[PDB]
Design an enzyme around this catalytic site. Structure first.
Site, PDB file in Angstrom:
ATOM      1  N   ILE A  15       0.798  -1.219   0.000  1.00 48.30           N
ATOM      2  CA  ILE A  15       0.000   0.000   0.000  1.00 48.30           C
ATOM      3  C   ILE A  15       0.833   1.272   0.000  1.00 48.30           C
ATOM      4  O   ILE A  15       0.258   2.359  -0.150  1.00 48.30           O
ATOM      5  CB  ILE A  15      -1.017   0.024   1.165  1.00 48.30           C
ATOM      6  CG1 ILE A  15      -0.293   0.021   2.510  1.00 48.30           C
ATOM      7  CG2 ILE A  15      -1.981  -1.156   1.074  1.00 48.30           C
ATOM      8  CD1 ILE A  15      -1.214   0.287   3.684  1.00 48.30           C
ATOM      9  N   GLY A  16       2.148   1.192   0.175  1.00 50.95           N
ATOM     10  CA  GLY A  16       2.953   2.403   0.187  1.00 50.95           C
ATOM     11  C   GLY A  16       4.430   2.081   0.144  1.00 50.95           C
ATOM     12  O   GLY A  16       4.840   0.923   0.043  1.00 50.95           O
ATOM     13  N   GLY A  18       8.053   3.279   2.283  1.00 52.45           N
ATOM     14  CA  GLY A  18       8.645   3.973   3.399  1.00 52.45           C
ATOM     15  C   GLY A  18      10.134   4.214   3.222  1.00 52.45           C
ATOM     16  O   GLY A  18      10.723   3.935   2.175  1.00 52.45           O
ATOM     17  N   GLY A  21      11.713   0.615   3.001  1.00 52.58           N
ATOM     18  CA  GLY A  21      11.127  -0.418   2.159  1.00 52.58           C
ATOM     19  C   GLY A  21       9.624  -0.222   2.018  1.00 52.58           C
ATOM     20  O   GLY A  21       9.119   0.896   2.111  1.00 52.58           O
ATOM     21  N   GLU A  22       8.935  -1.340   1.797  1.00 50.80           N
ATOM     22  CA  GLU A  22       7.511  -1.329   1.497  1.00 50.80           C
ATOM     23  C   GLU A  22       6.676  -1.181   2.765  1.00 50.80           C
ATOM     24  O   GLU A  22       7.113  -1.515   3.870  1.00 50.80           O
ATOM     25  CB  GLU A  22       7.120  -2.633   0.795  1.00 50.80           C
ATOM     26  CG  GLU A  22       7.680  -2.777  -0.612  1.00 50.80           C
ATOM     27  CD  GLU A  22       7.311  -4.100  -1.258  1.00 50.80           C
ATOM     28  OE1 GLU A  22       7.257  -5.122  -0.541  1.00 50.80           O
ATOM     29  OE2 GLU A  22       7.092  -4.116  -2.488  1.00 50.80           O
ATOM     30  N   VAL A  23       5.464  -0.662   2.588  1.00 51.27           N
ATOM     31  CA  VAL A  23       4.431  -0.651   3.618  1.00 51.27           C
ATOM     32  C   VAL A  23       3.254  -1.451   3.079  1.00 51.27           C
ATOM     33  O   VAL A  23       2.809  -1.219   1.948  1.00 51.27           O
ATOM     34  CB  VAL A  23       3.990   0.781   3.967  1.00 51.27           C
ATOM     35  CG1 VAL A  23       2.960   0.761   5.095  1.00 51.27           C
ATOM     36  CG2 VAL A  23       5.194   1.637   4.339  1.00 51.27           C
ATOM     37  N   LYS A  41       5.416  -2.692   8.068  1.00 50.55           N
ATOM     38  CA  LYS A  41       6.637  -2.192   7.445  1.00 50.55           C
ATOM     39  C   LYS A  41       7.674  -3.306   7.436  1.00 50.55           C
ATOM     40  O   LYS A  41       7.952  -3.908   8.478  1.00 50.55           O
ATOM     41  CB  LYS A  41       7.207  -1.014   8.238  1.00 50.55           C
ATOM     42  CG  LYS A  41       6.459   0.291   8.081  1.00 50.55           C
ATOM     43  CD  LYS A  41       7.169   1.386   8.866  1.00 50.55           C
ATOM     44  CE  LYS A  41       6.615   2.759   8.557  1.00 50.55           C
ATOM     45  NZ  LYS A  41       7.630   3.808   8.862  1.00 50.55           N
ATOM     46  N   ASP A 134       9.609  16.758  13.786  1.00 47.56           N
ATOM     47  CA  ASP A 134       9.181  16.714  12.385  1.00 47.56           C
ATOM     48  C   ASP A 134       7.659  16.669  12.292  1.00 47.56           C
ATOM     49  O   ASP A 134       7.082  15.884  11.525  1.00 47.56           O
ATOM     50  CB  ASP A 134       9.822  15.542  11.631  1.00 47.56           C
ATOM     51  CG  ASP A 134       9.649  15.649  10.112  1.00 47.56           C
ATOM     52  OD1 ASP A 134       9.309  16.743   9.624  1.00 47.56           O
ATOM     53  OD2 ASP A 134       9.843  14.631   9.412  1.00 47.56           O
ATOM     54  N   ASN A 139       3.129  13.585   8.269  1.00 45.45           N
ATOM     55  CA  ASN A 139       3.413  12.647   9.350  1.00 45.45           C
ATOM     56  C   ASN A 139       2.228  12.428  10.274  1.00 45.45           C
ATOM     57  O   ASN A 139       2.409  11.853  11.359  1.00 45.45           O
ATOM     58  CB  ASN A 139       4.641  13.116  10.144  1.00 45.45           C
ATOM     59  CG  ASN A 139       5.923  12.956   9.356  1.00 45.45           C
ATOM     60  OD1 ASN A 139       6.033  12.045   8.525  1.00 45.45           O
ATOM     61  ND2 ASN A 139       6.896  13.831   9.600  1.00 45.45           N
TER      62      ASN A 139
END
Length: 262
Positions: A15-16, A18, A21-23, A41, A134, A139
């Protein structure tokens, strides 16, 4: 530290992307417990041991917290590969892109409710002596019920950062309050970029020369005034997070007060 058996985790869909790597979206089912949806994650593909520790540092920090407006850690997978961090699933993703997709489509009261949830999360972090550094709409994550939750717990973001933090590297809850005022502007502008096309040094110079972002279209004057309060140059003059929550609560109780626009 909430190590979880890999057999309890099913990855359903990427789905995303990061930092490491991948989410993915997935399912977590542990003995004696009902199945729940999770964000997953993963860290794979020949990484350094320092990158591994940096990846997992986010879980170490996130697992210290428990609050409805702070992303919840479900657990970690570290005794096998790939390494995984599992958190609560947030169906609407990041707040800045969610609002861009829905430009003009939520009411002022709904936007104030989102801001109140973010401010409650920050009130809790400040009480725990945690400085985020941040805080930005990218975020903040959003669930199906529009509840907003602070994320990203594991290259200074200039246009979100208070001038004393830029100049002297002094990060405090009062510098997070400055960032929170930027978030308010992002929300009331449905995800516009702070300062538009200005460069990082242009932003630094403008702030030092007394420029502040103007009210977004249709933004209640009382909300823009709260932004200006968060952007006072003297960090000791800014409101603290408990005061910010109280001011938003008053707007929700007295919605007639949100009618005055520039």
């Amino acid at each position: 530290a909430k190590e979880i058996d890999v057999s309890y985790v099913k990855i359903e869909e990427v789905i995303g992307a990061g930092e490491f790597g991948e989410v993915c979206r997935g399912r977590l089912k542990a003995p004696g417990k009902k199945e729940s949806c999770v964000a997953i994650k993963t860290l794979k593909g020949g990484y350094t041991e320092r990158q591994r520790r940096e990846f997992l540092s986010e879980a170490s920090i996130m697992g210290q917290f428990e609050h409805p407006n702070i992303i919840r850690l479900e657990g970690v997978v570290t005794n096998s590969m790939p390494v995984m961090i599992l958190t609560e699933f947030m169906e609407n993703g990041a707040l800045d892109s969610f609002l861009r997709l829905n430009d003009g489509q939520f009411t002022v009261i709904q936007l104030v409710g989102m801001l109140r949830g973010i401010a409650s999360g920050m009130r809790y972090l400040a009480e725990m002596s945690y400085v985020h550094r941040d805080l930005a709409a990218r975020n903040i994550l959003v669930n199906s019920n529009l509840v907003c939750k602070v994320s990203d717990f594991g290259k200074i973001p200039i246009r979100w950062t208070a001038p004393e933090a830029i100049a002297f590297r002094k990060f405090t809850s009062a510098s997070d309050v400055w960032s929170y005022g930027i978030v308010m502007w992002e929300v009331m502008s449905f995800g516009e970029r702070p300062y538009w096309d200005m460069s990082n040094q242009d932003v630094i110079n403008a702030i030092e020369q007394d420029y502040r972002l103007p009210p977004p279209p249709d933004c209640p004057t009382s909300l823009h005034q709260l932004m200006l309060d968060c952007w006072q140059k003297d960090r000791n003059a800014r409101p603290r997070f408990p005061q910010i929550v109280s001011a938003l609560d008053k707007m929700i109780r007295n919605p007639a007060s949100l009618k005055i626009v520039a």
